[PDB]
Amino acid sequence: FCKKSTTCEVLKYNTCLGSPLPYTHTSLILAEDSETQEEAFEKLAMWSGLRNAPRCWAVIQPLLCAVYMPKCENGKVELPSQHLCQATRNPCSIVERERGWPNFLKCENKEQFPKGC
Numbered sequence: 807f808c809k810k811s812t813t814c815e816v817l818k819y820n821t822c823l824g825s826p827l828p829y830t831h832t833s834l835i836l837a838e839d840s841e842t843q844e845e846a847f848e849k850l851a852m853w854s855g856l857r858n859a860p861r862c863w864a865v866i867q868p869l870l871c872a873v874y875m876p877k878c879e880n881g882k883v884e885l886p887s888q889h890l891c892q893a894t895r896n897p898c899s900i901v902e903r904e905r906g907w908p909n910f911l912k913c914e915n916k917e918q919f920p921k922g923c
């Protein structure tokens with residue numbers, strides 16, 4: 807229950823929000839606001855506005871990467887963990903006020919954020 811079946815594509819980027827990626831394949835299935843790696847790129851740049859709130863950023867950056875450019879190997883994408891999502895709710899509370907969290911970034915969505923892996 808910590809992986810999801812999907813088709814893998816070749817990464818067009820070797821970096822997510824400044825972090826070098828140790829894998830070469832991904833999928834867009836977890837990011838319901840993106841149908842291409844180009845859209846995901848754009849959406850992440852938009853999210854990088856939270857760099858100005860380091861306490862939020864330190865926890866949201868690894869989350870965003872796990873949702874927008876997750877590792878895909880052998881027809882399977884790795885799901886972000888519960889602890890990963892939860893740690894972001896308080897320090898990134900401003901997101902709820904400004905725009906809200908979309909379905910695929912709500913910690914409640916157990917299908918997307920299983921405990922614990």
Ligand code: NA
Pocket residue numbers: 834835836837838839840841842
């Ligand atoms: Na998508």
Ligand SMILES: [Zn+2]
Pocket residue numbers: 816830831
């Ligand atoms: Zn490859």
